[PDB]
Design a protein around this nucleic acid. Structure first.
Ligand code: MG
Lengths: 106, 97, 95, 87, 95, 106, 97, 82
DNA sequence: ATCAATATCCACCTGCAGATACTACCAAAAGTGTATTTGGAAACTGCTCCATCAAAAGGCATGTTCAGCTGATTCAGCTGAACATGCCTTTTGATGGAGCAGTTTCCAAATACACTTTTGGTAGTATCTGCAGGTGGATATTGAT
DNA sequence: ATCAATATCCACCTGCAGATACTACCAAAAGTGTATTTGGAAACTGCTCCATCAAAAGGCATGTTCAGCTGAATCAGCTGAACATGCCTTTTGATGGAGCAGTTTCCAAATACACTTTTGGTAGTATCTGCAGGTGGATATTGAT
């Protein structure tokens, strides 16, 4: 008895994802490969964000990823920024950014 | 008696608040505003505390992002001072009108 | 005392793979959980629509693939597509 | 239940310093005196819209209590998706 | 050859009740059809979410009503709601 | 046999609306009154737009509603405009509107 | 010898084009552009006539509305002449940048 | 007399669009900026339409392909089906 | 002011592109009737967490002062609007053919269904640890001179 | 540039809130295995409707001229930043109690067929007409003097 996750070589739960596709009223039928492909996309995306967020945590001399690190990760990455362009990460704050003309002297 | 020049503490505050993530509006006053507005829609409502915090996080992130757009509208006008006309322009272009 | 599922343990697994010495706060985890559910909903939805538009009653890995191309920007799409193809190909050979 | 205080003018609990802080986070260096009332007005419209939909979800569910989830769904509806509260 | 359904006839009927001497071009009719399809999808979509949020398996007129309140502006919502309630009453009290 | 539309008092097809709800993967089940309600709402908004578009036709010395008239109807109405705030009516054009500062100095 | 002043014909044109609904880009050149752009995504594509039309209607509606925002952006800066920075600001605020 | 396809979107044509947009006065550099903007617009929309075409296994982009692409970009169009 | 160029308005005319009425038809809803499944309200009640309150901790309100920003004024020079027409690109329509779409086909993969194993969630009790917030104390940054 | 007020930056430092750790259980997943139905791919093809092109149409490239707009410069006036000062309001920890949510019982309403009737879409064909352009003539607008 090998899980469908181990069959596909995935950490993310293929069984859970198959189930959610059914209960979710997306179509009459769900193909067997659909939850496999989806669970991999989901796993890929979360690896991408944890990598970048992990880096922000290290850059900050921290060992624990907090919401600020997720925000720095997403906003500093062109593609994640666009994908979450209409999303708000609670307790993430903003990127340090001051417009040029606002700086003193000349 | 010592004095910083107008603009200097302002830039200090910008770096300070751009660095941190805490909510910037005091909790209770915000909670009262929420309850006042909700009550005008429907009497005898309760709120989970996380419901109030959700609204706070959303409203603060909405206001910060609007202020950035507003700042850009002022700068476009060759000013450094945000005015109501800047907010109004930003909201018009955004489709909030 | 009802059961509430989350992607937490899976997010944590994936976290250990990429940064073995790094932890995650519960709040960051909650955000990670929301992100997975959100992306799930957006892909399934595009897939749902796509299937309807082509008079199909079945959501297959092919629908999911087009949904991914529609939803993700350039380079994330390219890589997501390889990861998903790979998982399905592997999965097909493994029973 | 015996008595419950009247809620009025709570918009003013959004003080000048709190607004100034928010502008600072948005990168603003100089703030005209009329910004504070304009901002209060803008925030009110924003809250009315979100609370209305949130409360609608509450009533549909037949609860007396507005949940984090009611708010999260109200935000999603308006294209202001929020992560961090179960949504 | 395959059947292409449309709201055209029903829109033309409602036109005649509302302006009996006014006609409508093809292009305008096509727009009206899009409008009806669009509003349908928006309302059914919201109704779907509501039922799901509340762990219900049925889309009832209660869900349609809440959906309308969520989607239509003030006055538009008010009439839609009363038009809808009115139609459900007439339908009930009819053999 | 009497149709559900006639029963409900409507021009818009209850049967079709019911059918479309079923095969739309909206939920496992569809209540008896829901298609009745929804059809009524759809008919109502149709009447509203046709009312105002008919008028715009009249104002412009015409008996046939064209896309122009549908546009004028929608954008001159605060509520219809909001509902259709992210919609484009093909061959609609725009409202006549010039910013005052652009007017020649009298 | 007769000559209309700068802005007279422009005003006349605004009035004319705000009255009508016809497309304002010649069809052929737009069609070529459409095909050129599509070729980078897939080769040997054909287009339904109505497909190209749909694209033109959507593209013209988009550009017309963007010019409205752009114009508000010029006027905000106390000009009557639209400039690339006005288009730039409008797009940034819209969230397209 | 070879000419780029984008340049087929001519000054007078961009001038007309601006006019319907209520624009009185137009800077020389606007015409090139507009062309860039149109290109990004068409890229984003065509990309998605073609993606719909490929999914259906066609070699013809249909009005519906385009209408669906517009809908998902949040630029719903009425008049061509759907 | 007058005056003339030229745009704009309107009444009337009319061919035809596009709207509409009608018949015969058929596949396909939409409806009627009978057998069967189940979703969800109600009714009771465990128990989370919300409203509420007393004490403790720190941000807000206010007035004074003046730096420097905004908005008005003026001006020159640059830059876009207006202008007329034949070159040349687009539009129009006429014609072969590509592929979309309608039809039939048949099986790989879909749902269903019932015992069989596994596991993700919680729940109760325990020890662990990253870092926030306190401190002092050396190194900038800023603004007067 | 030099001096001095004050913000800033670490480095270390104790408490502890929040995170991580097991031991035990368990309801509901998820898997396994077999019987039953079917979606859609695959293959053939008819006929739209699409790319092409010849002849016709009519919009735009072009360079000149200068009106009037944009942006630089200058500056008075006053608004908004900074900071001192006095103290109210929020934050934080503790506690009876409303309503949410968990479980189970039971029926009104919905699905599932199959069969019976109709309606909405197409299609062939002929029939009809609102109004886009064209004309012709008065009248308004704009710009020159
Ligand atoms: Mg009140």
């Amino acid at each position: 008895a090998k899980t469908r996750s181990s069959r596909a070589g995935l950490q993310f739960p293929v069984g859970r994802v198959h189930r959610l596709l059914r209960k979710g009223n997306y179509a009459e039928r769900v193909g067997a490969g659909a939850p496999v492909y989806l669970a991999a996309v989901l796993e890929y995306l979360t690896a991408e964000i944890l990598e970048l967020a992990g880096n922000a945590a290290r850059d900050n001399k921290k060992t624990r990823i907090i919401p600020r690190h997720l925000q720095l990760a997403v906003r500093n990455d062109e593609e994640l920024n666009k994908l979450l362009g209409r999303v708000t990460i609670a307790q993430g704050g903003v990127l340090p950014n001051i417009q040029s003309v606002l700086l003193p002297k000349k | 008696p010592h004095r910083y020049r107008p603009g200097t503490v302002a830039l200090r505050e910008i770096r300070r608040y751009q660095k941190s993530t805490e909510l910037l509006i005091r909790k209770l006053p915000f909670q009262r505003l929420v309850r006042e507005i909700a009550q005008d829609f429907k009497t005898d409502l309760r709120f989970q505390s996380s419901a109030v915090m959700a609204l706070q996080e959303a409203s603060e992130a909405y206001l910060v992002a609007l202020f950035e757009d507003t700042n850009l509208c002022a700068i476009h006008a060759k000013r450094v001072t945000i005015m109501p006309k800047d907010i109004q322009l930003a909201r018009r272009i955004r489709g909030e009108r | 005392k009802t059961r509430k599922e989350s992607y937490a343990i899976y997010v944590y697994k994936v976290l250990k793979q990429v940064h073995p010495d790094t932890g995650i706060s519960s709040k960051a985890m909650s955000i990670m959980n929301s992100f997975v559910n959100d992306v799930f909903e957006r892909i399934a939805g595009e897939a749902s629509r796509l299937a309807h538009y082509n008079k199909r009653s079945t959501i297959t890995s092919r629908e999911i693939q087009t949904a991914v191309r529609l939803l993700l920007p350039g380079e994330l799409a390219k890589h997501a597509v390889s990861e998903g193809t790979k998982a399905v190909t592997k999965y097909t050979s493994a029973k | 239940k015996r008595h419950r205080k009247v809620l009025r003018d709570n918009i003013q609990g959004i003080t000048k310093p709190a607004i100034r802080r928010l502008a600072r986070r948005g990168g603003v260096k100089r703030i005209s005196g009329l910004i504070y009332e304009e901002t209060r007005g803008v925030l009110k419209v924003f809250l009315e819209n979100v609370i209305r939909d949130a409360v609608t979800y509450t009533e549909h569910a037949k609860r007396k209590t507005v949940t984090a989830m009611d708010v999260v769904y109200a935000l999603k509806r308006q294209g202001r998706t929020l992560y961090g509260f179960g949504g």
